Nucleic acid binder design. Structure first.
Lengths: 193, 60, 85, 50, 121
RNA sequence: GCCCCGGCGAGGCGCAGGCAGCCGUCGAACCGGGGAUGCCCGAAUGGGACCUCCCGCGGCUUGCCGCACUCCCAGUCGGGAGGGGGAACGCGGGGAAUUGAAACAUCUUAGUACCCGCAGGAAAAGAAAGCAAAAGCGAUGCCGUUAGUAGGGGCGACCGAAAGCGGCACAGGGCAAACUGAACCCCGGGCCGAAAGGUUCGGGGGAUGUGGUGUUGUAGGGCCCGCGGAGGAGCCCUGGGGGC
RNA sequence: GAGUACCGUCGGUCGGAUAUCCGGCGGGAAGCUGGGAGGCAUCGGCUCCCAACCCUAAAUACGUCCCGAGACCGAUAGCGAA
RNA sequence: GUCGGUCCUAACCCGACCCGUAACUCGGCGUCGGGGAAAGGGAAACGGGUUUAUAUUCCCGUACCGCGGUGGUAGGUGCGGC
């Protein structure tokens, strides 16, 4: 018990008690810094499903990002008209992945495992990010995570091996439609996505 | 100078010997500027042998 | 600096010999990284004399030259004879 | 009086020592093969990089 | 005060209740933790649910009061998690505890039950 | 260029055909293996750099060790991690114009050149919410064909696949939850041991759940009834033979 | 296994054409009496599957190094550099 | 030790924290700290001789500054002048 009720409360905040708590919490979170370590997760069901254990070596961080798309700098040389746009552009990475990269940048000895949405403003989105210390003995002893101290797993978030990166690389499709995403985007001349 | 002869002795004799050899090397380098033109080389290499053996005696 | 590691050469030139026999002074080529205290101690321990004054210069061959004045109770010429010259 | 920095002085001293002709016993030992090398520098002709 | 608190209890109860918890341990049966407690209500075994007030995030214990009213099981609040854990025999804190099979503390429970019924209605 | 262990077996002292000399038969030079010394700057890290040089704190006894920033475990003691470099190959983002279209604006050049970030000896992918069509297949990746085909396109110039078929190589495992509820993990010291790893004191975590269970299609698992109780495959090397 | 599957709209990208993938904005489920796909949408049949969490060798690419070989050059050649 | 640099600030520059950027060796930023003048501010040495070639730097003569000691005294507890 006790996990389904959290799930059901967060399935639609407006329709429950979570809306008002989030309004107050946002009032406070807007004062905080962009990246901030916290003690306990806000959504425990979602964290423990993406992999979170109450042990030494697990760290939780909250990250604030600005909403919307991107605006390109003005071209200084001559351009053709199809090449002139500035204002209506979107990033090919998602805001989740961008938040994870910010957290990674501020904690240089840890590795990102996953992340989850924790609220929205008119100006801002908030995500919570789970990190692991690979060189801690508890971690090196628990065999559900002990893979994370291998050579091939540093820079994980920067190379796109977290779940948000996989989604933005198109690796949740398998058959018809997915011809140009496997094994890499670079492998098919950048032509997917 | 040979390492067997250097390994029979005590660190204090080794130290006295380094002092003496350094003084000789300075004197010879002074006259050189004025019969065995290899004295300087052999003195250098002897000082080196002594320092090696002293270090290995201490590390024990 | 460790004494017995400071002195590299004595000098024997016209200027140096003049200073020996006129001002009770010796002249040595010395390690670049040595100070005047170190030079004083080196000379005093290697030759068992007492020192009055040390002066220094860096040459344009990259070497340090030291001029050492002993106290008048000791003669620079006896140490000069103890050295090669 | 002319106010040099010590490291610049030491580099100029090396450049000074570098500048001489090949020794004669080297030419003899080599049987007239090595007789000139690429770094004869004169102070009016070719300037160094300070 | 958080939003999962529906009335302000006075100290003497909270003082009564910790005892009831400590007692029923040395003698009777105790469930510790929100998961163990939540299952005991869903099943209908609890006589008293005890709930702390220093809980953040509130998500964890916000579902109990409405779930108890349904099954008509009574509940009282305490101010500390750390005390509620110690009483129950734990080196760690606890956010919820449920009394089941109370021994030697029956007529504390049935009294704590009555005082909080008016304090709710 | 200093020391040692083995080999070789008399000369040796770099490119480098000299004058003087020295080392070597107490086994050198040379070759294989292993140690010592190792100035200054440099990520450069006790603090500062218009000159790869300067200026300090402590504490122990001149001689010595320690004193950067960001973070984890902690905790007023300490134990750890990161930073920089690397030809080509690798992953993820940002992204032109010349040119061709016999001009040129959609198009092309091109997801190219170049820019930013992140890894390794390989990386990435990977165990069907798939492919198919009256038959069936069975994780991923690579090679040959499918094919200048389906299809896109001022339907212009041009662009452009996949399934299938033939081969190389093969391999499948684990969480969340339901149920249980401290039965759990880590650090240090006292012991036993070749060791796999046991056992004791003192600490840090953990009921906001450590450990046990369990991991799939009209199915699997849990609970519930019950008859059965071959987890025994791995690891440590006093021993041992063979082979490279 | 939820701001997820799905709808609408904008920008990019693709052979993907009313039927490719990526992102932003506005809406937004069921959840085992359940869910998804089958090249416009929808209704009914039949066939195939169970997403939104994790790891994984071999077959493959490269050669700042080493090794071997050559109807390759032979000092204005051949790497810029014998 | 006494000449100049090693101290101080000027206009100005940099780092950390913080904010932005898909990101950075990119752009900013009040504050904290650190740098920034051999003609600005800023303790203390003059004359004569000596060398092939240096000298307010060596020698002779006569001085000054800072720090640290030793020993005495003024003062603590003393006076002259509207």
């Amino acid at each position: 018990g006790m996990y389904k009720y959290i799930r059901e409360a967060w399935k639609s905040p407006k329709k429950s008690y979570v809306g008002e708590l989030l309004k107050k919490r946002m009032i406070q979170w807007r004062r905080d810094p962009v990246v901030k370590r916290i003690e306990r997760p806000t959504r425990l069901d979602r964290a423990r499903s993406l992999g979170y254990q109450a042990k030494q070596g697990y760290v939780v961080v909250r990250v604030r990002v600005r909403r919307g798309g991107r605006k390109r700098p003005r071209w200084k040389g001559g351009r053709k008209p199809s090449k002139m746009g500035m204002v209506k552009y979107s990033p090919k990475k998602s805001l989740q992945w961008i938040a994870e990269e910010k957290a990674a940048r501020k904690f240089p000895n840890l590795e990102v495992l996953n992340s989850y949405w924790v609220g929205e403003d008119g100006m801002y989105k908030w995500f919570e990010v789970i990190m692991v210390d690979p060189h801690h003995p508890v971690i090196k002893s628990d065999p559900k995570i002990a893979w994370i101290a291998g050579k091939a797993h540093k820079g994980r978030v920067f190379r796109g091996l977290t779940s948000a990166g996989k989604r933005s690389r198109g690796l949740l499709n398998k058959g018809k439609g997915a011809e140009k995403v496997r094994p890499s985007i670079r492998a098919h001349q950048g032509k997917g996505k | 100078m040979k390492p067997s002869e250097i390994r029979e002795m005590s660190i204090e004799e080794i130290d006295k010997k380094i002092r003496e050899l350094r003084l000789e090397l300075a004197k010879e380098r002074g006259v050189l500027t004025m019969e065995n033109p290899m004295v300087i080389r052999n003195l250098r290499r002897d000082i080196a042998r002594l320092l090696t053996i002293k270090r290995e005696k201490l590390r024990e | 600096m460790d004494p017995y590691k400071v002195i590299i050469r004595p000098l024997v030139t016209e200027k140096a010999v003049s200073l020996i026999e006129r001002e009770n002074k010796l002249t040595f080529i010395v390690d670049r990284r040595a100070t005047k205290q170190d030079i004083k101690r080196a000379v005093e321990e290697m030759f068992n004399v007492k020192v009055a004054k040390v002066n220094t210069l860096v040459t344009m061959k990259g070497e340090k030259k030291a001029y050492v004045k002993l106290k008048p109770e000791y003669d620079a010429s006896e140490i000069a004879a103890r050295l090669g010259l | 009086a002319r106010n040099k920095p010590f490291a610049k002085k030491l580099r100029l001293a090396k450049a000074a020592k570098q500048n001489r002709r090949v020794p004669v016993w080297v030419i003899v030992k080599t049987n007239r093969k090595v007789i000139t090398h690429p770094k004869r520098r004169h102070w009016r002709r070719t300037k160094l990089k300070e | 005060k958080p939003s999962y608190v529906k009335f302000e209890v006075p100290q003497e109860l909270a003082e009564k209740a910790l005892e009831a918890v400590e007692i029923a341990r040395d003698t009777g049966r105790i469930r510790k933790g929100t998961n163990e407690t939540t299952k005991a209500v869903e099943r209908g075994q609890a006589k008293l649910v005890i709930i702390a007030e220093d809980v953040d995030p509130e998500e964890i214990v916000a579902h109990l009061p409405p779930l108890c009213e349904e099954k008509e099981i009574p509940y009282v609040y305490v101010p500390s998690k750390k005390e509620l854990g110690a009483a129950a025999g734990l080196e760690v804190p606890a956010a919820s505890v449920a009394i089941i099979e109370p021994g030697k503390a029956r007529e504390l429970v049935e009294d704590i039950a009555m005082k909080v019924k008016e304090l709710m209605k």
